[PDB]
């Protein structure tokens, strides 16, 4: 709560995992998605 709002620290109302992850990590996950599937380890808000 000191540096970020709670809905942003816990990815409840923030940005996509394609926008708050490191670009290198995004590229690594999309490159190794076929056999290691990092994708389900990160959460994205999906607000209404």
């Amino acid at each position: 709560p000191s540096m970020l709002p709670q809905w942003s620290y816990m990815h409840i109302a923030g940005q996509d995992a394609s926008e708050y992850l490191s670009p290198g990590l995004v590229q690594f996950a999309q490159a190794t998605e076929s056999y290691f599937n990092i994708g389900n380890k990160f959460r994205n808000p999906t607000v209404a």
Binding site: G14, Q15, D16, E19, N44, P45, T46, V47, A48
Partner: peptide
């Protein structure tokens, strides 16, 4: 802009 209404992620049927 109609993006406010869209949820924030972050008809050719005729035969007999």
């Amino acid at each position: 802009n109609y993006a406010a209404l869209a949820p924030r992620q972050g008809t050719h049927e005729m035969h007999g």
